[PDB]
Design a protein around this ligand. Sequence first.
Ligand SMILES: CCCCCCCCCCCCCCCCCC(=O)OC[C@H](COP(=O)([O-])OCC[N+](C)(C)C)OC(=O)CCCCCCCCCCCCCCCCC
Ligand SMILES: CCCCCCCCCCCCCCCCCC(=O)OC[C@H](COP(=O)([O-])OCC[N+](C)(C)C)OC(=O)CCCCCCCCCCCCCCCCC
Ligand SMILES: CCCCCCCCCCCCCCCCCC(=O)OC[C@H](COP(=O)([O-])OCC[N+](C)(C)C)OC(=O)CCCCCCCCCCCCCCCCC
Ligand SMILES: CCCCCCCCCCCCCCCCCC(=O)OC[C@H](COP(=O)([O-])OCC[N+](C)(C)C)OC(=O)CCCCCCCCCCCCCCCCC
Ligand SMILES: CCCCCCCCCCCCCCCCCC(=O)OC[C@H](COP(=O)([O-])OCC[N+](C)(C)C)OC(=O)CCCCCCCCCCCCCCCCC
Ligand SMILES: CCCCCCCCCCCCCCCCCC(=O)OC[C@H](COP(=O)([O-])OCC[N+](C)(C)C)OC(=O)CCCCCCCCCCCCCCCCC
Ligand SMILES: CCCCCCCCCCCCCCCCCC(=O)OC[C@H](COP(=O)([O-])OCC[N+](C)(C)C)OC(=O)CCCCCCCCCCCCCCCCC
Ligand SMILES: CCCCCCCCCCCCCCCCCC(=O)OC[C@H](COP(=O)(O)OCCN)OC(=O)CCCCCCCCCCCCCCCCC
Ligand SMILES: CCCCCCCCCCCCCCCCCC(=O)OC[C@H](COP(=O)(O)OCCN)OC(=O)CCCCCCCCCCCCCCCCC
Ligand SMILES: CCCCCCCCCCCCCCCC(=O)OC[C@H](COP(=O)(O)O)OC(=O)CCCCCCCCCCCCCCC
Lengths: 92, 203, 283, 121, 98, 116, 67, 103, 54, 116, 93, 133
Amino acid sequence: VYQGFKVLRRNPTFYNPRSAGMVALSYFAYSYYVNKYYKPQNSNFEEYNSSHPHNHDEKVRQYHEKTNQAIRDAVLEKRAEHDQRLREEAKL
Amino acid sequence: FLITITSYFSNIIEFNSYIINLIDFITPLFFIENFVIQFFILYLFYLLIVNNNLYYILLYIFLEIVFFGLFLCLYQLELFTGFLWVAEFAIVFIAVVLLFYLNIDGLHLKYNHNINNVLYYTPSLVLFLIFFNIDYFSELELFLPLELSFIDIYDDYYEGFNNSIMNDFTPLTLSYYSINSAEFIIIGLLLLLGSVACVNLYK
Amino acid sequence: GFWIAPLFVNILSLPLYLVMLVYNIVCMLLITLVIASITLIERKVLSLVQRRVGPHYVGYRGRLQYIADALKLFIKGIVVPEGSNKFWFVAIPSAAGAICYTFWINSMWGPSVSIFDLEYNLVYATILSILFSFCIMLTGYFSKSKYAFMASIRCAILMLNIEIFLGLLVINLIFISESFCFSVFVIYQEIIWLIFIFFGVSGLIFITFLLETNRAPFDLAEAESELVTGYSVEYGGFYFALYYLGEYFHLFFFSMVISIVLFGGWELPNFLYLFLLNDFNIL
Amino acid sequence: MGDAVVIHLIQNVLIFGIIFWLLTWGAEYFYTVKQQLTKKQFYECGFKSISELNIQINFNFFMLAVFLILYDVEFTFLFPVLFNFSMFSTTELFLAFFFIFLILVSLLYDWLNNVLSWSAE
Amino acid sequence: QNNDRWVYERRKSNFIAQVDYEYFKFNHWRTAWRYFRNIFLLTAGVSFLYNMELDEGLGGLSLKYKEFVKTNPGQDLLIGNIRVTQRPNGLLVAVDAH
Amino acid sequence: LQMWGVGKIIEIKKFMKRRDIELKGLQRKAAPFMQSMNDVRHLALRERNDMLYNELLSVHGEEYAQKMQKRFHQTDIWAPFRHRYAYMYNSSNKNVKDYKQVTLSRYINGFDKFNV
Amino acid sequence: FCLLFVLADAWGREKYAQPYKSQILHGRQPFGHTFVQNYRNQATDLGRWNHNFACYEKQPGCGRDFD
Amino acid sequence: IFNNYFLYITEKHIKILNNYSIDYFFSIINITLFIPMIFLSNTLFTFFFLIELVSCAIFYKFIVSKISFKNSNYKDNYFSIFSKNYLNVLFYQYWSSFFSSVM
Amino acid sequence: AVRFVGPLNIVFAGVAFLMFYENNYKKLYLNPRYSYTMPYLQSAKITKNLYEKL
Amino acid sequence: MLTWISFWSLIFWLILIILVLKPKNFISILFMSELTWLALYCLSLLFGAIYCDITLLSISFFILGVAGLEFSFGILIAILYKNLNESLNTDLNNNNNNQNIFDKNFKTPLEKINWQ
Amino acid sequence: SYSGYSLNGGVHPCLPFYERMLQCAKSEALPIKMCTAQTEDYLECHHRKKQYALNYAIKKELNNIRIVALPRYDEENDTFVPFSQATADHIFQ
Amino acid sequence: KMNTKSFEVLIHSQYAFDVCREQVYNFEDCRQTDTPLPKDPIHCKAQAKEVLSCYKEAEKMDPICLSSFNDSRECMFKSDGNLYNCKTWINQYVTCQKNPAAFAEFLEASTAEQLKSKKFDFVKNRGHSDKYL
Ligand SMILES: CCCCCCCCCCCCCCCCCC(=O)OC[C@H](COP(=O)([O-])OCC[N+](C)(C)C)OC(=O)CCCCCCCCCCCCCCCCC
Ligand SMILES: CCCCCCCCCCCCCCCCCC(=O)OC[C@H](COP(=O)([O-])OCC[N+](C)(C)C)OC(=O)CCCCCCCCCCCCCCCCC
Ligand SMILES: CCCCCCCCCCCCCCCCCC(=O)OC[C@H](COP(=O)([O-])OCC[N+](C)(C)C)OC(=O)CCCCCCCCCCCCCCCCC
Ligand SMILES: CCCCCCCCCCCCCCCCCC(=O)OC[C@H](COP(=O)([O-])OCC[N+](C)(C)C)OC(=O)CCCCCCCCCCCCCCCCC
Ligand SMILES: CCCCCCCCCCCCCCCCCC(=O)OC[C@H](COP(=O)([O-])OCC[N+](C)(C)C)OC(=O)CCCCCCCCCCCCCCCCC
Ligand SMILES: CCCCCCCCCCCCCCCCCC(=O)OC[C@H](COP(=O)([O-])OCC[N+](C)(C)C)OC(=O)CCCCCCCCCCCCCCCCC
Ligand SMILES: CCCCCCCCCCCCCCCCCC(=O)OC[C@H](COP(=O)([O-])OCC[N+](C)(C)C)OC(=O)CCCCCCCCCCCCCCCCC
Ligand SMILES: CCCCCCCCCCCCCCCCCC(=O)OC[C@H](COP(=O)(O)OCCN)OC(=O)CCCCCCCCCCCCCCCCC
Ligand SMILES: CCCCCCCCCCCCCCCCCC(=O)OC[C@H](COP(=O)(O)OCCN)OC(=O)CCCCCCCCCCCCCCCCC
Ligand SMILES: CCCCCCCCCCCCCCCC(=O)OC[C@H](COP(=O)(O)O)OC(=O)CCCCCCCCCCCCCCC
């Protein structure tokens, strides 16, 4: 920096070092809080696909999954039977 | 050895199963460049809060633009970084001219931000930060070892030799001139009508 | 050695950074010498136009005039006005010098002979020019001379005009090259220089060159008759030397840009034998 | 756009400027600066400046900047079609000409209203 | 004048000059350093030490099994109430010995 | 002159495209082998990851591990997982290196491995 | 005037062979463009897509291989 | 249809008395031309752009509002009277548009 | 023994030195080293094969 | 420390909070509005890269144009402040007492309230 | 809208799932309940929630002490050899 | 997988494409899909292994081909992978590989200029209208 000293005399490091440190500490604390506690809670991956889920949300999700699977299986079977019956009736 | 020490009363597997939760909680995961970028963005926000001089506010807005460009470069959106910088440096230039016209001396209103900071803004921000997180399941880098990720090494040579593109404007043209051409024309009409409105406001 | 090697992993790389710094210093010193020679050439060419000898006694036959003036500018003392802002008065020329000495990175001397593998050369040039205009405006403002402030406003107007003029020129040029890199122009200009397509707007190209170079009739910011000196009316010594160096750097590098984008760059004028040339050779 | 080499080169340029700083400091040895009344005051062609820091200018050409803000974006919107004009089709050609015509009409309206010139205030 | 009324009636007190004996100690920066080192230790240092110890233990177990196979291949290594066994696919795993 | 110069530039572009046809042909000839090598390496990494996942998750149960690994009901489509998609350089990476290597290799010898 | 001239010329270029007809009237865009534009387009009905050659069956010379 | 009826009433009023310039009704023309296209929007993206265009047209209409009238008050010939209604309208409209657009 | 720096500063210096040494050690001895990452420690020979340890 | 998604999602509303918080000077509010538009620009680019959405990537220039038009309108209004005789510091355009201002004091334009 | 393009002008990776979902929605008389499979596949290809859950589980397992040494990969033969066996390419050798 | 560098792999493939044509066709047919999106390599692993084995078989060359291979390597090193610029040397290598017996007479009928060291410098000699693509 040409005339680096004259340029950096007034503000070598910070204008309000205390406030800069408070900003850094708040940012660090908030990142810690979010990542460690808040986002994992919302994601709810601790008991994901657990065979014995103790969480109501996970139990509801597994219920939705099994119910959708049962619906798809039943409808596929019924449609196959219906198509077979129609094909049999066609050749008469 | 930790295994030898633990073997006297339990197994290392059990000791780890008990202490690893606390270890993970106290483990900081971040990269120096990302931390620096984010901290400087937030520090520029703080400087904007505490500075009332219009010239310094404009300088900090310019530095914020520079740091946004730096993030885009880190994320590898270099073309958009360049476009942002060229588009906004002219705006900052015009803002400097406007400051020369109005408030040349730089003297600003004698405003004390502490009163509102303690009455409304600090607690409201605390509540918003406590109850606000939209990121659902995005994972930080260093969350898992980089050696588990492998897709970035995959290369499609058939598509490569079938690809004739040579510039990074292909998505932009496919959007502005093929798919979002309706919004492109709307923007053109909006700018024309805005020029008319500006002329009428001048009159 | 096995247990000592890890201690030097980061210690054995500092010499490499030092070598990189040394090479950059050499490049910057060489370009500074080129600009000094350009200043001497300018004085001699004006002397020819005005029918005078020009620099002839500072060094035998005026061979060291630029060296003498640079050393004198270093020697001259500097004082900051009491009413002026001490920090900004020195900060602005420092930033201007840094930007001007960063100019040379956006230069190509061959198909891929560039210090860095930059693609958006035109974007870099526009950004650097905008930054230098910022520095000139701040110089004029923080030096409270009314003439300097008027020079800064004139610089703002020149920047406003340059935006559209250079943007339209670049828009017309990229329509052929299809890239911001300087190399892609020469491959098309091998057969015929791109200036032939723009022969009709040759006057506008000349206007663009002069306007971007801040030469007459576009020396409004530094107008020495309308204004005392311009934006540097209260700057002396190396503070003013930095502005002069930046102006000449911009002149040299935009001359290079024009030569590459419109006059074939590093391709000889093969159009002078176009009639006699053959487009193919089949045995 | 570059890489970290650009930041390292910025640092190298600052280190280079330190060389000129050293030369300027060393030059201090070959002259002495006396303290005088008007030596550190604003220069106004050999007389004291009446006003300082109240140097407001008249921004009576602000319409040009206003229109520059719009036309910069208008021109920026044309880059992708110019870059990939080899891929042009009927729709893309029509849209490009439509946009250019809109720009021309806006410029014509500005000329008609005479907002591209200096005004009294 | 009513615009500048506040400045006219502002009461300004003359400064009192005193010698500052602790200016160069930079106590605020010392406090910043203390806070930074405390946080760094408590989080990063503890995590690094524990992770380094785990990695050293895993590497030691790997090398010990690599040497043990040469002496007698196919036998699971027992160390510290832990059983190190090689799966048929070739993946070493450490499990509870009991 | 403008019309003739534009015509000449189009002639140059079309000649370049004519040669690009042959370049594309050569690239097509070379494509299958590099694709095979890339696929083999990709599948080797996938096999390693599958083994690691099975070992780590089978403790809770084989069914649990299978449920965790399964991602799509219909397997006729291949959708690799990516945190983000490459955009610059036609969805490629110019600098496959660390930042230190990227900075130094432009001035220091030995970083480039001379792929010939 | 230039627009009218080029449009008239483009409409007159129908005399030339298919590859040399005016690109204003006939589209010649990359594979990424053409696939999305004509994927389920019954108006064009190009057919199946050649993956390793990036073209539809009905496009002229879609799969062009050596020998 | 509703725009047509309101335009008819406005034409009658203008014949009664003229305090509105041609730019005022040109802005009304733009609003009438572009505002019904909103209901044809099939995506929130196109809806946002159409509403932005209509907002610009309405801002144009507010800009072209008549300011000074030739009334029968002869007392303020040589005194400055300050009216902030024009700036208030423009300020609030502009900032409301900004907030709505960003959100 | 007697120390001008505090015990906490000594602990910080020790742990920082351990971090530095462990990082360099793992980067220098537990790496494939097919890429030239540490100058003056890896060989700068010309490789005639895709994989040659440097 | 924070994932980019959460960081940008948070800083957008933080920028809005700063805009509201700072003293209401039209020029300052205009700068803050420009910064808000640029935050949206960055967030849209981030999401476009993540989801491979050309529409999200292309939102960049649309945001730039809207921001430019709004900035032009803001410049015009700030200039119009002069002819309308309004202080750029809006808080000085009303007589309401405000402890946030050190030197806010207005009197009726009179010299003496009592004559006799 | 869903353009279906990639970031280099190619095809969006979700296009097959999106096409399947749209086809099912058009064909079915009860698309909400009868297109669950296709819609979930599209949402998975779009959000990648399941992969993130798998990564979370794998991180927890790695934190737990169960894995010591993975087998080395012999790239010449495209095979996997146990870490115990010594090879020329082995880091330790 | 090959322990061979990229440009050498390209040079070898330019010849191997004619010897393992059936394997290449099998691999291509296996990887064919109805959309430009690539197919899962797990399905084409077997064809890929067959292609790679044939490529290993083909990579062998006669010693008389060494000079042509070296000059082609030098060309592909000086030019950053531009196959078109170096196709002449790659074509010579393919010719030597195919029926190497006749390459003896090929070399015998060589001129003095051809019997010289081949140095490539594309910066000095760009060529004619080189698009680098
Ligand atoms: C590339 C250019 C190089 C050349 C540039 C020019 C070099 C020469 C001039 C440099 C200094 C500028 C002139 C200062 C003149 C005034 C002197 C003075 O008052 O003291 C200066 C400063 C005083 O700062 P201060 O506390 O007064 O700052 C506040 C300033 N005001 C009052 C305006 C608000 O000295 C120090 O601060 C020294 C102690 C702190 C140093 C910084 C520590 C944190 C950052 C570095 C961390 C390093 C690693 C360790 C941390 C952990 C890492 C894991
Ligand atoms: C490849 C890129 C090439 C270009 C790189 C160019 C970089 C050149 C850098 C040169 C050295 C500059 C000093 C850096 C060291 C730190 C300086 C420092 O102490 O900072 C404290 C000061 C700010 O703090 P302060 O100490 O002045 O006051 C604090 C604020 N108060 C007092 C109100 C509480 O930093 C600066 O202002 C330095 C500015 C230097 C000039 C930069 C000009 C850039 C172009 C214009 C930008 C837009 C301006 C718009 C507004 C109008 C102007 C205000
Ligand atoms: C970036 C720099 C500029 C680049 C510009 C692009 C190249 C253009 C080259 C010139 C082409 C011709 C343009 C029109 C000229 C019209 C002249 C004219 O008015 O003639 C009548 C004029 C006067 O006639 P008049 O009628 O117009 O005006 C006289 C009026 N009465 C009659 C009343 C007296 O006669 C002349 O003397 C003309 C002499 C023209 C000589 C031009 C030489 C130019 C040399 C420099 C060009 C740049 C070279 C760059 C080389 C780079 C190599 C790498
Ligand atoms: C001793 C105390 C130290 C205090 C901390 C120091 C603070 C330094 C602040 C400035 C430098 C910040 C460096 C970290 C961010 C790096 C971003 C990045 O990744 O870019 C490389 C990236 C490289 O990415 P890439 O595309 O090569 O991909 C890399 C691939 N991997 C991940 C495999 C390595 O850059 C780019 O992609 C595009 C080039 C960008 C060039 C930008 C040029 C202008 C820079 C101006 C900076 C001005 C700073 C000083 C003035 C303003 C105030 C700060
Ligand atoms: C890679 C290539 C590198 C090339 C580098 C080339 C640059 C060479 C720069 C030379 C600078 C010389 C400075 C001389 C300063 C002393 C004279 C002076 O200023 O006088 C005024 C004042 C003295 O004034 P005075 O009161 O004696 O008055 C003199 C006038 N007469 C004779 C009439 C009485 O300077 C002093 O205060 C002198 C004593 C303190 C300084 C002592 C010398 C310090 C040297 C520091 C060297 C730092 C090197 C840094 C290297 C790393 C950089 C990154
Ligand atoms: C300027 C160039 C460098 C810029 C970039 C530097 C890197 C990026 C930013 C990093 C943060 C640096 C902030 C330092 C600010 C210090 C301010 C100060 O001196 O305040 C003293 C102040 C005041 O000192 P005091 O209280 O002794 O004196 C004042 C006395 N009274 C109150 C009576 C007036 O101390 C405090 O009360 C607050 C201290 C806060 C310290 C915060 C330290 C950082 C917290 C985060 C650490 C995260 C570590 C993560 C590790 C992970 C593994 C590696
Ligand atoms: C009044 C004084 C006036 C002084 C005028 C001087 C002007 C400035 C001149 C600068 C250019 C000088 C170039 C000299 C040759 C440099 C050679 C070199 O660095 O090797 C690169 C070479 C590049 O080789 P490489 O790229 O193969 O290195 C990598 C090697 N492997 C792969 C094995 C790791 O680097 C090295 O040799 C490595 C060690 C570098 C050690 C640091 C060198 C610093 C050089 C500083 C010179 C300062 C001169 C000052 C003179 C003062 C006189 C009073
Ligand atoms: C090229 C292509 C086109 C693109 C062109 C791009 C042009 C960019 C123009 C940049 C202009 C830079 C000069 C002007 C700004 C200088 C900084 C500034 O003004 O700071 C304001 C603000 C902080 O201000 P304050 O809190 O008062 O303290 C000041 C301490 N510097 O600042 C901030 O908010 C943060 C400031 C951070 C300063 C960091 C300094 C680091 C010094 C490093 C020294 C070397 C060691 C590096 C080690 C790196 C290790 C990884
Ligand atoms: C033997 C094998 C190795 C064993 C492990 C060794 C690990 C390294 C050593 C760790 C301990 C380092 C010393 C920590 C001291 C903390 C002191 C403290 O908190 O007191 C408050 C402190 C004093 O305030 P100050 O401003 O300095 O003024 C002086 C007033 N007396 O105020 C400050 O200065 C700021 C204090 C900040 C406190 C941050 C707290 C973060 C907590 C994170 C969670 C940790 C949970 C525990 C994890 C344990 C895991 C094993
Ligand atoms: C872009 C830079 C390079 C220039 C490229 C564009 C060149 C355009 C002119 C081409 C030649 C036109 C020949 C016309 C012959 C003729 O009819 O000539 C008829 C009469 C002849 O008059 P004379 O008896 O004096 O010779 O001339 C005219 O009518 C003059 C027509 C206008 C020419 C002005 C120059 C062109 C300006 C741009 C076009 C718009 C013109 C609008 C006029 C109202």
